[PDB]
Amino acid sequence: TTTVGITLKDAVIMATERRVTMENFIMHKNGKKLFQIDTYTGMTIAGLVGDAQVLVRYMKAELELYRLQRRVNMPIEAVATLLSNMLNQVKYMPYMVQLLVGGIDTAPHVFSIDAAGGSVEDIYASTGSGSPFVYGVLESQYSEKMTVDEGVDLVIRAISAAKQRDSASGGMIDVAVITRKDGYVQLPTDQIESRIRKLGLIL
Amino acid sequence: TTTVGITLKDAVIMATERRVTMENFIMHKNGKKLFQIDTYTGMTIAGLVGDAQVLVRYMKAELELYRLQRRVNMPIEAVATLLSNMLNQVKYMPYMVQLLVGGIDTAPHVFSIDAAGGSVEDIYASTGSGSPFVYGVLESQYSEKMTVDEGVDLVIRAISAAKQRDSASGGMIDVAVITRKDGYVQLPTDQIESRIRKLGLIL
Amino acid sequence: AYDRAITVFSPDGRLFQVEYAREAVKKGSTALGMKFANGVLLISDKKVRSRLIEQNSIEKIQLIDDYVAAVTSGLVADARVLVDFARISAQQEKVTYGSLVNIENLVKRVADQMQQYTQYGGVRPYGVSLIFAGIDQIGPRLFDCDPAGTINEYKATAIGSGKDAVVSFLEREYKENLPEKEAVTLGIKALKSSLEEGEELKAPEIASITVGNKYRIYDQEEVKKFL
Amino acid sequence: AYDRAITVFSPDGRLFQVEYAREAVKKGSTALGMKFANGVLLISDKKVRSRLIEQNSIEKIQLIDDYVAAVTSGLVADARVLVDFARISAQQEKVTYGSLVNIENLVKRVADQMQQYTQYGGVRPYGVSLIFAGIDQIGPRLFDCDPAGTINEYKATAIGSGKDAVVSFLEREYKENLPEKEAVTLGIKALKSSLEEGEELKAPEIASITVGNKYRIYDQEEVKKFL
Amino acid sequence: AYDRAITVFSPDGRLFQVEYAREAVKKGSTALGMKFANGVLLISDKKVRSRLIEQNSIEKIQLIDDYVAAVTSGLVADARVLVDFARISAQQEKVTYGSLVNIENLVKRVADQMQQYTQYGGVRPYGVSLIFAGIDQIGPRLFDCDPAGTINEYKATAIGSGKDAVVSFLEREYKENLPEKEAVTLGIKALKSSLEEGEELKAPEIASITVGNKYRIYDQEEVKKFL
Amino acid sequence: AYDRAITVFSPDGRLFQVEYAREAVKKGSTALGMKFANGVLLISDKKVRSRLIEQNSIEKIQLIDDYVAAVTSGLVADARVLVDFARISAQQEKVTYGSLVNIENLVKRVADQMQQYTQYGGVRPYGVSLIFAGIDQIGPRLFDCDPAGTINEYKATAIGSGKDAVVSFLEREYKENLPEKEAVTLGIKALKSSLEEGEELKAPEIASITVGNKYRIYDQEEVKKFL
Amino acid sequence: AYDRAITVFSPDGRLFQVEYAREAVKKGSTALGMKFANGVLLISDKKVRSRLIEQNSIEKIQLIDDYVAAVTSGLVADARVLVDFARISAQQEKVTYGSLVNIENLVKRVADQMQQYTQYGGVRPYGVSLIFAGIDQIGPRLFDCDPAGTINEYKATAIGSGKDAVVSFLEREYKENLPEKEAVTLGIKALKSSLEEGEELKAPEIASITVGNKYRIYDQEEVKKFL
Amino acid sequence: AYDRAITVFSPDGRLFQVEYAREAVKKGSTALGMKFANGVLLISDKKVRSRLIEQNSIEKIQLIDDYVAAVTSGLVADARVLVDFARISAQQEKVTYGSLVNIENLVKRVADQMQQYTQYGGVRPYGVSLIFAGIDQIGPRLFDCDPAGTINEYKATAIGSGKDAVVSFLEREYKENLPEKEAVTLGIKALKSSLEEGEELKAPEIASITVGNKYRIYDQEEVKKFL
Amino acid sequence: AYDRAITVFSPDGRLFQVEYAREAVKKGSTALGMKFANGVLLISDKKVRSRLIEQNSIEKIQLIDDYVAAVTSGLVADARVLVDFARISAQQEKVTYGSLVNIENLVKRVADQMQQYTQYGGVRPYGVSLIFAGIDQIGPRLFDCDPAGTINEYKATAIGSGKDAVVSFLEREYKENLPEKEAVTLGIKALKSSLEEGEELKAPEIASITVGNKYRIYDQEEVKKFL
């Protein structure tokens, strides 16, 4: 698998691929690894499928209960700290999952949480089997002065390189840009096909 | 990783590097391993990231609850004893972490606590993968008659040698001198770049 | 001599202590709600208090989800503990089934919780009644949960000190499937006819949902229209 | 001076607190049922209430399975907790034996549960009686479970405020193996002769099973025939 | 002022609450049994009730095994819970020893269970007496277990409202080793002489075992012979 | 006003509830025993009852081992629970030490058990006194355990309604090391002088041990000699 | 006759024991607070006591964080146990979320803790009210938590013996967003107008926060200015 | 009206129930002891009872070790349970430290055990006082432990019905470091002056230790010397 | 009628049972202490008792560390249990932090322990007040912990029957930073002016610490100087 999360000026862009295996044997050509976890933050999935979906359900639960009780969205450091505490309270029966939460509260953030519950900020992060390819292209092409369109084009080029060079990665890329003004919006698949045909990554 | 803690006349200087791996694969080029744990003492991190961050959260919690209840700062032997008791109450499901707490109460201290909870004072200590290089340069160049500026220059030369000779160590060094008069102050990154360019450790 | 314990029946066979919790509900201010053409609303009377009070925390109506909401009447301590339990049970239902599929066993969680305390000694019941309302897989829902735990699905109800007069009005005036505005004004007239003489209806909090939409609470000037 | 605790006998040897839970049953509305030629039915009186009430949630008859059903009388809170326990025990019975083999120890689960609370202090009994009815491996079943827990297999009974008058009628009029329609009309006459003078029998809910078939509830216009 | 708790003695040293449970037994209908030449029987009076009642579930005599059986008198709720505990303890004895080897510690299980509730506050005793009877490795057995738990091996007894009159009859008429029929007719005369004047003995359930055989219950027309 | 709880002392410092359990012992029939030249015996009065009772289960004397035995007086339910606990504690002592080494802490198990219930609320004491007797590694033993738990080693005692008169007789007549027969007849005279005028001493059960031998109970015709 | 247990309602449906804990609050000295233009303050009256007392430990205002603080009124024992629970709860919230994100569920923890004891027998409520105040992710906060547990967000309040008079003053005089000094002097006038005639306001402890800053307590000579 | 529960103080602040246990001690027979030149002794009055009683089990003095011993006064049941707990705690102290190093926290175990029951409802205190005495690593020890648990190290004391008169005598006559015989005769005179007129001091059990030696109990003829 | 349970408030909102534990403190003898120039002392009145009492165990002052010490007043049993808990909590604090860093939460352990028993039914409070005093990382400390648990840091206090008179004296005479001797003589005058007329102040135990030194208790002849 491969996930990516990129923080730029006033937005944070996250995308996954959609392929689930679950065996060697790629079984589901259209999965769901990118989840809207609250009204201004999302979570990606790059581990064991069942454990990861249970983590997504618990985090949707606790963040919605949060927003209902306190009537304000949870900060990104707070949700990643909560997620770290959950993953580290049970580490000798652990969740084999690599998480990556990202969102905006007063500044765009993306955090990366491993299976033992170590949360650490970075300006761009990635989890999954096809992670080093997207770290290569992000290291070579990333700029903090990008716009949202240049950022989502960089994200699509990244996941495309990971799909070209990795077996467990594949399928149609779903990308969701979360900004403060428009909220969590996920790009439709026709727009992503248009960006792929514009960038010349279709064959 | 590499951390360092040096006790001199009326101050104690601690610094880490900032690189997190979490894989082989150095993943985060800007981590956070040096933490202000109370108003006159700090803690460094050289173990497993998640367990170490949970230890930092618990020690910030207990020392702030301490200062609030008793209205005085906790002594350095007391915080390291508390940390030893925490690490040794659970040693068959242990925290794989090497800690190093340092601060000043009536005299500057730095203690070194291993994963089994053995606390022992020394005039200079270091934890991490790049620890023997900074022990070499501290053994060859350390003097107890140093000033704060000569001490922080020694610290930067140490972590620079460890970055030059160790793979898991790297990134920008963050240094924080804690003294009784000025309290816990962390040097800004421009000042640390100025000390590196003065000492001739940039390339 | 039998109305001292929660666990003792009477020569008629009555649980007075439960009925006295129901009397404790009757001391709270009136709150009503009904369903209409694709959705449900809630109306809650508030005699306006200290302007030092932040208005955010005197709302008798509370969101238990984006898609379930409720209103209380009775003891404020028990009331808040109950809306907390409703929220936590909504989250547990949502994590075990992926979504709040039907509102009914959210209210079953709340109802069984409130019922259990009407049976064991050393515990008193909750002196609060709750009116749940929302949209599920089925559609508009509207319940009331009383101190004994008894839940009933309605098309319109009230709770509180007015409850008899409001349900008396709605019992002879309510017609289903009203478009939202007309429904609200009917419910405002219902709330009006429960006060005593000389009392002027102040501004009540009112909120609604339609099928496929989320919650919204009419702010005070959208409320101010129907005065 | 002895009717205050569930755990104290009297100079006769009476448990008054249990008898007062039985008196609490007596304040509920009448509900009857009987078995016939291949199957059992249930009839339940309902004095028609607020049209604001969704009729789906005032049904005294409740399906505990496709092949077991029951009806209550007494406290409405305890009534719902009991029909919940009947459903959950039906599911536990069905999972440990593959199917609800016999209705009898579904009612034993419910009966032992209701009995236990008539024995320990700090707990009050359930003020509800339940009439179970269905088809099993044996055939038509018909029980009644009272507050003390006592179950008995019948061919016809009632519970509620009329119970004595209905069982008095059926005690001198009921003849077994009636074809379903004739049975229902006999039970309607039974329910009629328990009201007081001037009261007109409104529309009661009635439901039945035959051997090899599932449940069905006669809707209000199939009910309206036998008025 | 001392007969309110199960745990308080009197100036004589009496446990009245236990005696009031024993009084609750006395309000049940008479049931007797005795052993004879290779086997034991049981006789139980039943004043015939509603023909709507399925006769399968008014039997005071109950099979706790193919080779142990009993009869109760007192509270019907506690009575059924007790015969359940007798069955479950028979199965536990049979699984730990391969067979119900001796009836005595089946009745010890039941007796210790009934005794424990005569000692702890917050619990009331069982208001039921039980008469066990069967064949073991030793032979014909016949016990009675009272509310306090006290068990005694007899050659003939009764329980219930007649108990004194029946044991008074058997105390001057019973002779051991009667062939089954003669024994039964003696026990019928015993049961007859406990009623009040004008009362006609209806049909009582009677059942027996002989050594090496299983149980059988005389059906109503084999019973009808000895009227 | 203080004799209602087991946990309340009095202005003198008395535990009346414990004393009323001791009064409950006093209503039981007299049973005595003493040691002699190499061994101990026990004598127990029995006013002969119903010939329907199997004589095997009215024996106040009971074998707790082949080498320890006892006799009770008081409540028959508590009496049987106590002789059961004596047997089970004998088996536990025998499994942890290979043999019942000394009778004393068998009686300590029983004594601590009986004492504990004279201290905690929500529990009543045992209304039974027990007299243990047997042969150990030391020799002839003879104890009495009362409701409060108090044990004392004697050379001769009684319990029951006669206890004062029997210990008054033995207090001026008993001489140690009598050969078994002479001892028994002295104890029979002791038991005789505790009855009231006109009462004829019936046949009492008597049993004994000598050092190195097992138990034996004198059958009714060996008993019949000393009448 | 109903104001003896925490778990019994009254014929109106009142919990008097809770109200008497609220009366226990009323015996404590007055303490007020309000929010203003970027921040909140707290004022607490202290009738100056023994100069032997170290002034460090008579402060009704207490720092639960660098960024949350509170003040009590009522029982001093329960008061200190409560501010301890507030501190420990702040630390638990801070360790599970990295920071005290919102003050609201710190006060929810304190509130649920204080509420629970108003429901179970064998426990009395806390006779203390608490006023929380600080800066969070949202901004200036100001709550009051009463014995029953009820929390409410305010812009100004008091607790203690003056509470009605102070909230009466602030109810007609308070204007939001005052610069800190003007706010403090308004609150001092509020505290002044709650005393009785002849009483001179001594020096009260007053402390504040602004957005982005930490806590500070005005020392006695900065306090001495506004006398 | 306050002297009914162990957990209720009085308008003076008295625990009457504890004082009533102290009154229960006062009904026991007098027992004294003192230390002397290298060692301690104990003296215990016994009004000589039934010659049927084995004298081995009426000894108020009991060996809790070869090097600690004690004597009781009060309830005989609680007395024996206490000397048992003293023995078991001596063994636990001896196994965790290799030897009974100091007598003081053997008596602390006993004291904390006796104190705990003076604090919790549903439990009564022990109505026994104990006087411990022995040799440790320090030397001669002498304590008394009362029903409330209070322990005090003395050089001489008594307990029981005489206690005031004996401590009154020793308060004006005792001189330390007497050689053993002279000490004993002083203690005998102390015990003599506590009886009433006409009463002749019978033979009391007396036992002693010297430093480096074990225990010994003076037999009745070495006791008979000091009459 | 409300001063019978620890868990019931009053029409004013008072906890009388707690106040009666505070009254039980008042019956103990006076004990005072204050801090001075580098250190703190303690003074404790003792009306000299039986010379049979070893003086080592009537010391109201007790060492909880080499660097913390305290003195009690009230019930002697609870007093000793409390100084035990203070010692054990000092050891737990010392093992988790390497040293007794601050005296304050040693007294918090003791205070929370004493407070908890003023809240739960079935438990009575401790009828003891404690005055702690020592040197920590901060310096001279001096607390008092009352039955409700309330702790306060002072510069001088007393407890016991004189407490009001001693704090009245110190309230108008005490001046801080006295050199040790002058401080002690001031405290002796304080203790003198609390007795009644005719009473002569006997020899009181007095003990002190200075910063950097350990404890010492002035022996009786260093005490005898200041008479």
Author numbering:
A (entry chain Y), B (entry chain X): 1 to 203
C (entry chain F), D (entry chain G), E (entry chain A), F (entry chain B), G (entry chain E), H (entry chain C), ...: 7 to 233
What do the study authors state?
In archaea, the 20S is composed of homo-heptameric α- and β-rings, and PAN (Proteasomal Activator Nucleotidase), a homohexamer proteasomal ATPase, is the RP found in many species. Unfolded substrates enter the chamber through a narrow pore in the center of α-rings, where N-termini of α-subunits form a gate to impede unregulated access to the proteolytic chamber. We designed and assembled in vitro various asymmetric archaea 20S, in which one of the two α-rings contains a point mutation, K66A, which prevents RP binding to the α-ring. Our studies reveal that, upon binding of a RP with a conserved C-terminal HbYX motif to one α-ring, the gate of the opposite α-ring opens allosterically, resulting in similar proteolytic activities of 20S singly capped and doubly capped with PAN.
The second activator is heptameric PA26 with the point mutation E102A and the last eight C-terminal residues replaced with the last eight C-terminal residues from PAN (with HbYX motif), which we named PA26PANc. The point mutation E102A abolishes a specific interaction between the so-called activation loop of PA26 with a reverse turn loop in the 20S α-subunit, thus abolishing the capability of PA26 to activate 20S proteasomes by opening its gate. Instead, the HbYX motif from the PAN C-terminus placed at the heptameric PA26PANc C-termini performs gate opening. PA26PANc activates the CP particle in the same manner as PAN, except that it symmetrically engages the 7-fold symmetric α-ring, and thus avoids a symmetry mismatch between the α-ring and the activator. We first determined the structure of PA26PANc-αWTββαK66A to resolutions of 2.9 Å without LFP substrate and 3.4 Å with LFP. In both our structures (with and without LFP), the distal α-ring, that without an activator, also shows features that match an open gate, with all N-termini moved away from the pore and pointing upwards. However, unlike the proximal gate, there is no rotation of distal α-subunits. Rather, the conformation of this α-ring matches well with that in the crystal structure of archaeal 20S proteasome in complex with PA26 (PDB: 1YAR20), except that the gate is in an open conformation. The surprising observation that binding of PA26PANc to the proximal α-ring opens the gate of the distal α-ring is consistent with allosteric action.
